[PDB]
């Protein structure tokens, strides 16, 4: 099973936030550490995406675009899985050195969003998602958000996304049983998008007022949040839902 070999091989290992757990849980320290982690994760997402089967067939500008658009959803999805595997979704396992308890969820002013992310994490338990299903779903998530008036080479994108959907189908099939499962997984994938949108809105708002609340944004983060995220929030770039 070549495809699954590759997905396991390229999956990133442990990423630390660099969080000084000895300092008090303030808004500014928590979010500054979350932003540092976000950037470290983005670096890993780039290396992961570029090594995916077929990804290099995409026009290079489209390669950069889909990574930037999907980044937030990819991070949320993977964090949900870490949270499930490490702490049975009882807390948010952003990193080994940055695990959110209820106090941090409140102090970060992200409580409601954290609740939604914890619910996503719990889905991995409720649906008994396998590691293979998780990997294929995560790869599909990369191909689940595009500009409304299209990519530079939309046709190559459409073909690739089709092939990633087929691979998910094969993983399930490994007839009514398959059908039910595919429905459950596409529904789970759709459910990432509203959560990602809420995080996008929160992150954008935070960037705007960041100088006022003493929250640090790394330069590359600040670039993507100010250049790409508003394309999503203004509706120029939208998720591809399975279910209408």
């Amino acid at each position: 099973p070549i495809f699954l070999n590759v997905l396991e091989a390229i999956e990133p290992g442990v990423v630390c936030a660099g969080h000084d757990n000895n300092q008090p849980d303030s808004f500014a320290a928590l979010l500054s550490s979350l932003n540092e982690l976000g950037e470290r994760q983005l670096v890993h997402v780039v290396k992961w995406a570029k090594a995916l089967p077929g990804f290099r067939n995409l026009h290079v500008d489209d390669q950069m675009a889909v990574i930037q658009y999907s980044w937030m959803g990819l991070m949320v999805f993977a964090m949900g899985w870490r949270s499930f595997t490490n702490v049975n979704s009882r807390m948010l396992y952003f990193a080994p050195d940055l695990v959110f308890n209820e106090y941090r969820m409140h102090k970060s002013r992200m409580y409601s969003q954290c609740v939604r992310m914890r619910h996503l994490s719990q889905e991995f338990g409720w649906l008994q998602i396998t590691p293979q299903e998780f990997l294929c779903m995560k790869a599909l998530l990369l191909f689940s958000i595009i500009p409304v008036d299209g990519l530079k080479n939309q046709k190559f994108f459409d073909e690739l996304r089709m092939n990633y959907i087929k691979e998910l189908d094969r993983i399930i099939a490994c007839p009514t049983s398959c059908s039910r499962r595919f429905y459950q997984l596409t529904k789970l994938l759709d459910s990432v998008q509203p959560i990602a949108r809420e995080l996008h809105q929160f992150t954008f708002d935070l960037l705007i007022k960041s100088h006022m609340v003493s929250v640090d944004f790394p330069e590359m983060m600040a670039e993507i949040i100010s250049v790409q995220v508003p394309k999503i929030l203004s509706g120029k770039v939208k998720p591809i839902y399975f279910h209408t």
């Binding site: 983005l42 670096v43 780039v46 290396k47 570029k50 390669q63 950069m64 990574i67 930037q68 330069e219 590359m220 670039e223 993507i224």
Partner: peptide, 10 residues
């Protein structure tokens, strides 16, 4: 072009 720099650097 911070992101482009990273994309091409890796």
């Amino acid at each position: 072009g911070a992101f482009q720099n990273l994309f091409q650097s890796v």
